[model samples]
Target: MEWEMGLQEEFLELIKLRKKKIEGRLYDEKRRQIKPGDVISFEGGKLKVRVKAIRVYNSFREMLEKEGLENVLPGVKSIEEGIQVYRRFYDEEKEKKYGVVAIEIEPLEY
Candidate 1:
């Protein structure tokens, strides 16, 4: 299966370089369906990656800590800082409603 997602330019760079292997986001309906081996078309299909796994977390704090800050947000300094970055994209209430996930992925060969 193939899925499409928008990405921040900063984070997109790391993904392209394979420095960032984990993508964190709310475990909303769409994310809940993602599975290992599924393909993710990112940034309007400019990049494609295959999902390797999904690690669920109760909150961004936990996700960032357990997943490792570097894997999720390469330049971010701490889990608290990482949470703030995600906060800009997702509100607290929504995060609680859907929880969150760390999507393990690998860039597909072009």
Candidate 2:
């Protein structure tokens, strides 16, 4: 089925900010690293998904976002909705457990 996917730049920016916040917390808690062959699980109530990585890149987020991900910002309010939308979009497009999506953001050099 053909899906309708369009995200405003403004919404993308919002999501980018949210991602940074979440990532920041994860980093602070030392819970953000992934290794090849490692299995990661995410569960929301009864909904759960598990994924294994063949390769782990520190800049995977940057690379995925650069590749142009479906923006689901227009209809999102809470972070939960945002994540649900992402999962749905990933399933629709990649037909996998999870897929990376990008939101446009200003360049920042580390």
Candidate 3:
């Protein structure tokens, strides 16, 4: 599936202020594959993010299946659903190296 990559924070303050609902790490195949719409967070001097599936793109469906994410397609119905599914898949694949947190999305003033 189409994947995006980025970093994010674990702090509640940043999460609340940014209005980020569903805090988690977006993954890319590598640093060179980073793209837009990737939500990431940072804390202290540590890289709290892990790389894995994010949002599924129609073009990436084949690749997703190759990567073993297609089997879990039932769990990803919408953007939010995709994020949650990715969270669980990431955790399982990474051996729980990453953590999931709930975030609240706020409208952009601009």
Candidate 4:
């Protein structure tokens, strides 16, 4: 059984295209809450994304460097611009609550 999860509202298309392989979330000391095979849906219940892997990172710098900002930054030109776009959905409080955890998915069906 998959858990109910949502992504940034603006990037639902990424889920539609199966391009958004990683679902970034704030660390809330709730480890083991999500696991492989968990299908996550976007807000409003339009799109649902499946998960394949999960990992944790120290900061966005590390995340972008390793996962490539371009993957998550749909329609975004550069890393700086992408960062700004994400800032709209996230801030330091919850986004930086504990650290950063990356929910990774693979390509198949969009």
The model with the greatest lDDT is 1
Off by over 4 Å in 2: 1-7, 15-19, 22-80, 92-110
Model 3 lDDT per residue over 1-110, tens place: 23332334434333343333223333334423544334334343233233233443222232234322323232346545554556565554442332322221222321
lDDT of 1 by residue, 12-62 (tens): 667765535477878777777888868888887777788888888888777
Candidate 2 at residue 35, lDDT? Answer: 29
Candidate numbers sorted by TM-score from highest down: 1, 4, 2, 3
In model 2, the Cα lDDT at residue 5 comes to 25
lDDT of each: 0.78, 0.30, 0.35, 0.61
lDDT of 4 by residue, 1-110 (tens): 75565666665666554354454554555435667776665564566666777788876656766776765545667777766665676676766765666667543434
Model 4 regions more than 4 Å off: 5-10, 18-21, 28-32, 43-45, 106-110
Q: Write the per-residue lDDT of candidate 2 for residues 1-110, one digit (tens) a residue.
A: 11122345564344344333221111111122332223222221121112122222223233333322233243446545544554554443342323332222221211
The residue pairs in collision within model 4 are: none
Q: What is the TM-score of each candidate against the true structure?
A: 0.81, 0.25, 0.21, 0.67
Candidate 1, superposed: residue stretches over 4 Å from native: 17-21
With candidate 2 superimposed using the best TM-score fit, by how many Å does residue 22's alpha carbon deviate from the native? 6.7
Clash count per candidate: 0, 0, 12, 0
